[PDB]
């Protein structure tokens, strides 16, 4: 028996009122599916939201433990297992996800196999085990039949684009998605709606449409209880203010950091952007990671040195970064720092070009401001933002 079923019986023998609470929470018409779920092994709810809503409402502190055990007992050929994979992937519960993937790829249900293979492409691409050309080839090799994995195959490319500073394709890929084509799985369609809200938030951030960025993050926040989506919504709102309002930027990052608490991966996004925010506004930084050999961390060490007038040491560290593999957006930042250190218009022009190439309309303001101060034609600088 799965741990969730044991706990619910324990709690229900003390309190028969819990049946109606769980029925309502689970979106059931009557208690009968819940009776069946408690008493007969392998009975799944029609919608996976039923079990998640119960676990979150009744056992908020034990969600991971109970859902891990529940998911890894599911028949992997079922709708329930396919929903559980989306749950696991959405939450970045990698140990649940990878175990589901591995057993779904091997099973005889063609849908479950398709879901397993496509989520696996996402996992491989995000870890750097494959590149984007291999990912695309693997999507083509899969001969995808479901509307949902057709959509997910677009989303996984969008996630990679965002992570690799290659923003131009994201709005194009977005136009290929139609969520109304997902018919059978309301749990998953709903999860995908939240995914799309957070993706759209980032798309508008990168287009310098800050009001729409904030609107879509707020939409995600209003309709989710998944830590991952809350974290990224507050992160993206914080970034929307990074050039315009120190206090609101910081506030949103501190909120998000509190939502991230106890997940180091999530916490790191906030520490990184707080590092950048404090450096950009010339404040004493408490957030920098001096031990990391990630280029973005090393960039913040350098920016701090620039604020501390240690230009010679900043330049020596920046030269070490020229040896490193960087994406186009990262190179925007690189050349902006180089410009601040050397006072060469050349470096600011390169910074502009890299931000154009990554289709970053937010960050491009940084080198543009410096070029304006160095006597470049303001009208031309304005035209570059169009």
């Amino acid at each position: 028996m799965e741990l969730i079923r044991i706990a619910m019986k324990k709690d229900l023998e003390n309190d028969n009122s819990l049946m109606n609470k769980w029925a309502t929470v689970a979106g059931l018409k009557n208690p009968n599916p819940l009776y069946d779920f408690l008493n007969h092994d392998g009975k799944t709810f029609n919608e996976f939201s039923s079990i998640v809503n119960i676990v979150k409402s009744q056992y908020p502190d034990r969600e991971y433990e109970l859902m891990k055990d529940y998911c890894l007992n599911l028949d992997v050929k079922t709708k329930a297992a396919r929903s559980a994979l989306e749950y696991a992937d959405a939450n970045m519960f990698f140990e649940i996800e990878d175990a589901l993937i591995d057993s779904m790829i091997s099973c005889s249900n063609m849908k479950s196999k398709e879901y397993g293979k496509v989520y696996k492409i996402h996992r491989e691409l995000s870890k750097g085990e494959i590149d984007v050309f291999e990912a695309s080839a693997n999507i083509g090799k899969q001969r995808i039949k479901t509307a949902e994995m057709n959509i997910f195959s677009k989303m996984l490319l969008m996630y990679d684009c965002l992570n690799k500073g290659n923003f131009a394709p994201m709005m194009l890929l977005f136009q290929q998605i139609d969520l109304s084509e997902i018919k059978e799985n309301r749990y998953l369609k709903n999860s995908f709606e939240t995914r799309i809200n957070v993706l759209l938030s980032n798309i508008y951030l990168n287009e310098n449409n800050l009001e729409l960025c904030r609107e879509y993050a707020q939409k995600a926040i209003s309709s989710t209880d998944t830590q991952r989506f809350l974290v990224f919504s507050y992160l993206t709102i914080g970034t929307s203010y990074i050039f315009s309002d120190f206090n609101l930027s910081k506030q949103n990052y501190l909120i998000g950091l509190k939502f991230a608490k106890g997940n180091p991966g999530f916490e790191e996004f906030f520490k990184r952007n707080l590092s950048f925010l404090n450096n950009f506004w010339n404040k004493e930084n408490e957030w920098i990671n001096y031990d990391s050999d990630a280029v973005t961390d090393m960039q913040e060490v350098i920016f701090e040195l620039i604020n501390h007038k240690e230009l010679s040491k900043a330049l020596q560290l920046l030269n070490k970064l020229e040896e490193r593999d960087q994406n186009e957006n990262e190179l925007g930042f690189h050349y902006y720092l180089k410009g601040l250190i050397t006072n060469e218009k050349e470096a600011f022009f390169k910074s502009v070009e890299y931000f154009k190439a990554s289709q970053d309309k937010l960050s491009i303001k940084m080198p543009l401001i410096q070029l304006e101060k160095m006597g470049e034609n303001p009208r031309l600088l304005k035209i570059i933002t169009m």
Binding site: L162, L205, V231, F232, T236, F269, R272, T296
Partner: peptide
């Protein structure tokens, strides 16, 4: 630099 996620 700035990091992003969804």
């Amino acid at each position: 630099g700035v990091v992003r996620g969804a």
